[PDB]
Design a protein around this ligand. Structure first.
Ligand SMILES: [Ca+2]
Ligand SMILES: [Ca+2]
Lengths: 34, 34
């Protein structure tokens, strides 16, 4: 459950060189969970 | 909530000071605020 979920909420938002997330993508994560 | 406010949030999360967030760091963000 938990393990899979993480990889997804990385990869969904995470367009560029993802191994990483940036500021806009960070905004998106915040928008998803609150 | 603003770009200015989010800059701080980014910094809080960006533990390893790389100007990015990664997979493990993402966990912390996802958890907030369930
Ligand atoms: Ca990315
Ligand atoms: Ca980081």
């Amino acid at each position: 459950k938990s393990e899979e979920e993480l990889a997804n909420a990385f990869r969904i938002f995470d367009k560029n060189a993802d191994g990483y997330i940036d500021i806009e993508e960070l905004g998106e994560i915040l928008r998803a969970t609150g």
